[PDB]
Amino acid sequence: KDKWKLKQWYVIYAPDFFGGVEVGLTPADDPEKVLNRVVEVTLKDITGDFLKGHVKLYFQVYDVKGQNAYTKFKGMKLARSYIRSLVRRRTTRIDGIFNITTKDGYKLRVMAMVIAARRIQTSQERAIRKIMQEIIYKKAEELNFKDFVLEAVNGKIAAEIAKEAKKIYPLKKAEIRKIKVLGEPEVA
Amino acid sequence: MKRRPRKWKKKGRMRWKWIKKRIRRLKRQRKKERGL
Amino acid sequence: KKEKWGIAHIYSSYNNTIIHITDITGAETISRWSGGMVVKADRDEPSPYAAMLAARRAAEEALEKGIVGVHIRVRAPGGSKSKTPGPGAQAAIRALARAGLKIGRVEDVTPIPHDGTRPKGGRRGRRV
Amino acid sequence: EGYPAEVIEIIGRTGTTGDVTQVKVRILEGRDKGRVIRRNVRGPVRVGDILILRETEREAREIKSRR
RNA sequence: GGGACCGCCAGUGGCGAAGGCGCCCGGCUGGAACGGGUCCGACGGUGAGGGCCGAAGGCCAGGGGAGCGAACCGGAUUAGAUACCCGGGUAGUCCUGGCUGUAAAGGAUGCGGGCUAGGUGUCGGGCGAGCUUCGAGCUCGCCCGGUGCCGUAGGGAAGCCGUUAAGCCCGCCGCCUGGGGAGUACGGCCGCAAGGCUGAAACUUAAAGGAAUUGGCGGGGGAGCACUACAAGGGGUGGAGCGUGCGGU
RNA sequence: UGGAGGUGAUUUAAAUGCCA
RNA sequence: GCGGGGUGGAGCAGCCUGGUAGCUCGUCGGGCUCAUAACCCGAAGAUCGUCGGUUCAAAUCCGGCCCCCGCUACCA
Ligand SMILES: [Mg+2]
Ligand SMILES: [Mg+2]
Ligand SMILES: [Mg+2]
Ligand SMILES: [Mg+2]
């Protein structure tokens, strides 16, 4: 059918900071329409080594220049079955939800999680949480936006919470889980 | 109603809840019904 | 490149089943098939048989327009109701690949609430 | 239409009147030709017969562990 | 754009006088356990009448009305079905100031003190040895506190309790004295209402109630059968006239 | 050895019975 | 001014579209249970008020007569 057979195959790009690597094919007629659809892909597909298979990412387009939608970051999500495989009995998860902003002004909301080895009472728990918020605050003052999203999802901050939180009690699989954007700044 | 719990046993009788409700429909009466 | 791809949402139930074959971003539908379209009886509206039939015919459409391989997204009504998938899952996905379209990442996206709203019934259940 | 498949094991008898029979057989030819499936048959059967079927994709429904 | 709960870790796990109490951060705030060659100097137990708190439900107003929804309107089901099933939907649930003071409010066990075997986990604290990525960590003993199970002396009609007595000793308190008629009657006391606290008698009957023991049964669960059971097959009676046995007249 | 607790499930239409 | 059905013991179905009164409660009787009721099935059962017309042919379309008769001229 023409309604079908009048479509037109635009292409998407990885956002610039990841290094442009093409992903996906999308059909559409007129360039005014496909400007607020979103994408999900893994990390493995964009220069990804397998063992980062359980990471999941999001871009939203922002422009249509002649069969090219250059994307823009939107968020990041982990695999629900994956974390489901961590929280078992006698484990006592630890939650942390935080608001930060960035040098260049992007303000974001992150939700990072730890898991101890045993059960522990709060007065040896909440300190962990305070420690996480601290060693993230300091972090998010020196970095641009694009670079911040780079290294957390690279898998880097984990190796630091899983360093200064051990100094209270031994633990396993410390890391950040989901990242959602809030707005975008006025400058530039 | 100053309960007496030997009656709920439902042995050779009827439920208690649904007897209370019916005694109300007569105390409300002999109070209202020209008991003035 | 030349890799045309797409996403198939598959929505199950106790009472019917639904297949939705879509573009990559998910906003542009391609082909839609149900259970109430092929078979008739309402005993077998949930059978695996209608599941297969409609779920082969779905591929038999979306295979011409250009879709090649597919990712899967399975889902139950969930939410404020039952959390169990219908038995039609392997009634579609076992047979879908058998229709020649490839397979990529496969996942269910069952919606669960953190203490959602009130279920039906109430203090005595579906008192059959 | 004429597809034959070969019986390679009898597994049990189900049916409200003890009539069907759980029997894991192998297809011998076709787009499958080598996949071994699960079906219930009617009549008497021996290990080593040559059965015809007509769908090669039905995947009969499981039993209560044969016992 | 809204309104209403805070999933999985979650533990005979903690906290409270009892009802209750579970997303996160800052302030305010009561109590208990532990460790203490600290201080005051019998200052205590109970408690009639008295005084406070007290899930849900109803009601006074004002706000809020997502989902859930007696009342109420439909289709079903049915011998009927004002009940079970289904599609809708008023009051309520929700927020502020109130009166109501009702529960299987159940450890169905009031509250304080002394004593009388041993075993076995687990939360807090502490003391002692070991390790230890040296961490506010991980093992193992021993002392004092709450929460669990098995079981001696003894105790009970037996279910069963066993230092968290239903054992043995010293205190104070409230109720019960066949069963119903009955929590009714008449009278007073608080309530805005609905109702709540106090509570007899005439007469009628020979017993109602508890704990365990065999068996029958179960539209309870397992094990195992049979052509007077079914499945799979073969042949029939019921329908005609007649032989022959009962019913009845 | 025996339980002692918890989460889910748990099925059409099936009324009644002199006399010693 | 009219105008309607003119139907088995009972609801009257069915009427321009034309050949089987058409099912349903009830009456006889036969089945299942141990026995009853529910449940099942054969039977009885009027044959369209009635004289007609139209109609090869009928309630079926149109009329004589008559059964019972159901709506005929209200807001201080
Ligand atoms: Mg008593
Ligand atoms: Mg007193
Ligand atoms: Mg039923
Ligand atoms: Mg009978």
CB atoms within 10 A of CB A111: 14
CATH label of the domain that carries residue D61: 2.40.50.140
Tell me which method was used to determine the 3D structure.
Answer: cryo-EM
CA angle A30-C23-A83, nearest 5°? 130
Chain B 16-35, CB < 7 Å to strand E: 19, 23-24, 27-28, 30, 35
Length of chain D: 67
B6 touches strand E (CB under 7 A): yes
Which residues are CB-neighbours of B20 under 8 A, at least 6 positions away?
Answer: B1
Nearest CA in chain C to A1: C65
- Residues A107, A183 contacting (CB under 8 angstroms): yes
The Cα D23–Cα D37 span in angstroms is 9
CB atoms within 10 A of CB A115: 17
| C1’ E78 / CA B11, Å | 31
> What domain count does chain D have?
1
- Residues C93, C106 contacting (CB under 8 angstroms): yes
In order of their start, the domains of chain C are 3-120 (3.30.420.80)
The Cα D20–Cα D43 span in angstroms is 7
Which string of b and e fits D22-54 if b means at least 16 CB within 10 Å? bbebebeeeebeeeebebbbeeeeeeeeeeebe
C40 touches strand E (CB under 7 A): no
Residue A48's Cβ-count burial label (10 Å; 0-12, 13-18, 19+) is middle
Compute the 3-state secondary structure of chain A and give helix, strand, coil in percent, each to the nearest 5.
25, 35, 40
